Structure 1
Amino acid sequence: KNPKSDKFKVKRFHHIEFWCGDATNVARRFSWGLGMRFSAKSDLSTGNMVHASYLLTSGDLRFLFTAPYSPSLSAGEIKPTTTASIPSFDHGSCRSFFSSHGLGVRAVAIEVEDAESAFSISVANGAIPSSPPIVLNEAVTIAEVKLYGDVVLRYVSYKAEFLPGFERVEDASSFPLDYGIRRLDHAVGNVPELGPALTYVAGFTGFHQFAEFTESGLNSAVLASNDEMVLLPINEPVHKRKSQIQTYLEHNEGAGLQHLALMSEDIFRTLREMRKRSSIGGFDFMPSPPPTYYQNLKKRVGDVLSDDQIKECEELGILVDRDDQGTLLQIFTKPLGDRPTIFIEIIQRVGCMMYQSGGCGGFGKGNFSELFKSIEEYEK
C-alpha cells in the first residue's frame, strides 16, 4: 500500500544536472544522441564568469550540463557578488567530483511547493545539508541535501524561464530535435549498503517503499513520493560472476547514480532514431537478446502487442516485462562516458489508467531471469 507519508509537498522531477569537464561537448553529444533541444544557457555570453551551464529539453525532461571556468575569471567575486547562476556551484567541488567519478550526475532535482520548507523539514529529519536555501531574483528558490555518495537531491520551488540568470535559446543553434522522450521516469543509485541508504533517504523525505528485489547481481528497493511520480530506486551489490554494482562502485570510486530511465511516448520511434545515430556521435545500446527471447514474447504479451509490434521489438532489441497491472517496454544504452558507470534506460509503460499511475508495470526485474533462460535456450 501507499501510506502517503511525504514530509513535504513534492510535485515532480524537475531536472538532472551533470558535472562535466567540458559542458559544451557533452551537451552537444547528448542533444544529438537523445534528440533533446538546446533550450537555455548560462555562461560567459550571459555574464556568468564562474561556470558554463547548458540545458537540453525533450518534453518535460531537462538535462543540465555544467563545467567550471578558470577560477581566475571570478577571483574578485564573493558569494554576495557572484555571477554564478547556480550559487551552490563551487569550482573545487566540481573538479573534485569529476576527477573522482568522471562524467556523472551531480544533482537529482525535484520540484516542491516550497524549497526552503522542504530543506528545513529534511535537515530536521536527518538530511545532511549541502547548500542552504537560496532565493534567486525573488522568483525561484533552490536548496540541496546529500542523497548518496557525491549526488545531491536538489529542491526547487517557484512563486509563479528555467532559472534566473539563464538565457533562453530559441535562435539558430536551437534546432528542434525530438525523438519522443518526454519525462524522467526514475533515477537509480548504487551504494555499498542498501539498508542505511534506504533508512537515510526515507527518513528525511517520508518517501514510502514502492517495491523491492532480492539471484544475479544486486538487491534493490524503490522510494516514492505520495503520488508515486518521483521514483528513486537504490541498488547494492550481492557478493559465479562479479556484481555489476560492484564494478560500478570500483570504477566510480564509490556510490553514485547508476541509471536514468527516460519515458518515451513512442519507444519504437525513439529507438529507431537513437539507433540510426549510434555510430555517428550518438549512444550505443547493450547487445540485443537472442531470438529465443522474442519467441517467448507472443506467449507472455501476445494479448498486449500485435505480432507486428512484437517483431518491431525484435528489430530494435527492446525488452518487455509485465506485472499484474501493466506492461513495460525497456532498453538500456551502453555507458554514457569513458567509465562503466552511468547509463540510460528508455522505457514506455502500458496500462494503469485512472493519467497513468507511476511505476505501471514495474521496473523489468522479470527480464533478468527471462534473459538468463532465453540465452541458455539459444545456445541450444
Structure 2
Amino acid sequence: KNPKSDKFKVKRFHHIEFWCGDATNVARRFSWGLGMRFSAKSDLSTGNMVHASYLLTSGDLRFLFTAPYSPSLSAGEIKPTTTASIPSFDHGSCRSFFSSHGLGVRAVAIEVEDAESAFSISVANGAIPSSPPIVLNEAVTIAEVKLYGDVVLRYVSYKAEFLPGFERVEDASSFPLDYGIRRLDHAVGNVPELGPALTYVAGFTGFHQFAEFESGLNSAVLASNDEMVLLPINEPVHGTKRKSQIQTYLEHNEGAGLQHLALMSEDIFRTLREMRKRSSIGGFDFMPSPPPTYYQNLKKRVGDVLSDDQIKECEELGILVDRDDQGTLLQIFTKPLGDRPTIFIEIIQRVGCMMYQSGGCGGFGKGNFSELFKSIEEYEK
C-alpha cells in the first residue's frame, strides 16, 4: 500500500555530504576506492575562506566532502558577507560534529520543487529546524532540518552547476574514473529507539512506511511518493547472544547517525571486481565472504534469475542475493569507511519491477540474515 502522503513535491536524492577533518584526503581516497570523478570544488582557490568542499560524482551519485579552514581566515566575515559557498556551514558545528562522531555523513540531501516551502511545511509539521532557507545567486534554494542525531535532511531546489560558488574542475585534474556506480539507492540511520524516530520523520515529510517481504535490529523504511527516496532506520535489539551491531554503532558514534549508504550499480559484478582490485591499495575493504554453503544454496532460491555462471561470479565476489515477491536484489557491504566501526557502504543492483524500475525492487536484503546464519552453521558441518 502506497498512500502517497508526501507533504511537498520530493524529486530525488541529490547528494550526500561528509564532514571531514581533511576533505582533500578523504575525497581522494573515496575517488580511487569507488570510481568517482572530481566534478566541482569550493575552496581557497574559488574564494571560499570558510571551508574546503570537493564534489565527487559517478552517474547521478554526488558525494560532497567538506572540512573547515582556520577560523582566523574568515574572522572579519559575518553571515551576510560570508565567502562560504554553503551558508549552513559553521566552524564550531563541524568541529564538534567530527570530534563527537568521527568521519561520517552530515547531510542527506534530496531535491525538491521548492526548498523554502518544503522547509516551512516540514517545521510546521514537527521538524526541528537546522538552517533556514537561503537563496544562492537567485538560482538555488537550500534549507536543512534535523533528521536524526546530528544528521540533517537537506532540501535543495533549482529554478531551472552543483551550487553557486562551486567551480567545475579542470579536465587535467578530473580523471574519468567509473566502476559502474550510478545513483544512491537508500540512506540508513541508526537510532536508539525506532518508534519515536519513525514518528518524527514520517511526521514532517509525509513519507509512508514501505512494506517488508531475530539478530541485531528492528528496522523500518520510510519512502516518498514514487518511492525513489528511501530512508530506512534501525534500532538495536538488546539481550541478543551476539551484541547488536546497532548498539556498537551508537557507542562508537556517540549516538544516532547515518549507518550505511547503498549505492546502485548498473553492473554490480564489474563494480565489485574494480573495488576489490583496489581494496589493498587505497580503496575499500569488504566484509568477509559467506561460506560456499551460502552459494550451494543460491541455485535453489534464485536459480531462475541468474545463470550458473552468474551464480559462481557472485561467489567469486562475495555478493549476497535476496529476493522479494516482485524482484531480486544483489548486495555486498564494505568494512567501515574510516577509523570507527560506524558508517559503511553497500553496493546493490536490482532486477525486476519494470513499468523504468520501481524503487526498492527486491527489498533491502533482510532475509540474508537468516540465509547466512543457516549457511554458517551448515558450513561448520
TM bin (shorter chain): over 0.9
Q: Deviations over 1:75-102 (max 9, x none)?
A: 0000000000000000000000000000
Q: Could you list the per-position Cα deviations for residues 255-289 of structure 1 after superposition, in whole angstroms to 9, with x for gaps in the alignment?
A: 00000000000000000000000000000000000
SS in 1 for 2:227: coil
Please name the residue that 1:228 is paired with: 227
SS in 2 for 1:374: helix
Give the alignment's Cα RMSD to 1 decimal. 0.6
TM-score of the superposition, structure 2-length normalised?
0.99
Checking the alignment, whether the CA contact within 8 Å between 2:224 and 2:230 is kept in structure 1 is: yes
- Gaps of at least 5 residues in structure 1 are none
Identical-pair percentage = 100
CA distance in 1, matches of 2:117, 2:305: 44
Offset at residue 148 of structure 1 (A) = 0.1
Shift of 1:211: 2.9
> C-alpha distance in 2, partners of 1:125/1:288?
44
Measure how far apart 1:170 and its partner are: 3.6
Q: Deviations over 1:215-241 (max 9, x none)?
A: 000000000000000000000000011
Provide the residue aligned with 1:272 in structure 2.
273
Separation of aligned partners in 2, 1:137 and 1:211: 41
Distance in 2 (alpha carbons) for counterparts of 1:9 and 1:171: 35
SS at 2:153's partner residue? strand
CA distance in 2, matches of 1:107, 1:223: 17
Give the CA deviation at 1:212. 5.0
In structure 1, how many angstroms separate the alpha carbons of the residues matched to 2:70 and 2:212?
Answer: 45
- Larger displacement relative to structure 2 (148-157 or 163-172): 163-172
Distance, in Å, in 2 between the alignment partners of 1:106 and 1:47 is 23
Deviation at 1:171, TM superposition (A): 2.1
SS of alignment partner, residue 339 of structure 1 = coil
Deviations 1:132-175 (A, max 9, x none): 00000000000000000000000000001000000001421100
Q: Deviations over 1:348-374 (max 9, x none)?
A: 000000000000000001100000000
8 Å CA contact retained: 1:212, 1:220: no
- What is the CA–CA distance in structure 2 between the aligned matches of 1:368 and 1:59, rounded to whole Å? 30
Q: Which moved more, 1:41-50 or 1:168-177?
A: 168-177
Q: Is the 8 A contact 2:5 2:206 kept in 1?
A: yes
Structure 1: distance between partners of 2:323 and 2:218: 20
Q: How does 1:189-338 map to 2 (within 5 A)?
A: 189-211=189-211, 215-239=214-238, 240-338=241-339
2:55 matched residue in structure 1? 55
For residues 32-76 of structure 1, what are the alpha-carbon distances to aligned partners after superposition, in whole Å with 9 as ceiling and x for unaligned? 000000000000000000000000000000000000000000000
Any unmatched runs of 5+ in structure 2? Answer: none
List structure 1 runs of 4+ shifted beyond 2 angstroms.
none
Question: Deviations for 1:100-129, whole angstroms, at most 9, x for unmatched residues?
Answer: 000000000000000000000000000000
Looking at structure 1, the residues matched to 212 and 52 of structure 2 have their Cα atoms a distance apart, in angstroms, of: 39
Q: Structure 2 CA distance, aligned partners of 1:233 and 1:41?
A: 30
Residue aligning to 1:346: 347
Query: Secondary structure in 1 aligned to 2:270?
Result: helix
- Distance of 2:278 and 2:296 partners within structure 1: 28
* Distance (whole Å) between structure 1 residues aligned to residue 216 and residue 127 of structure 2: 29
- Does the CA-based 8 Å contact 2:212-2:363 persist in structure 1? no
TM-score, normalized by length of structure 1? Answer: 0.99
Within 5 Å, which residues of 2 pair with 1:153-172? 153-172=153-172
Q: Offset at 1:8?
A: 0.2
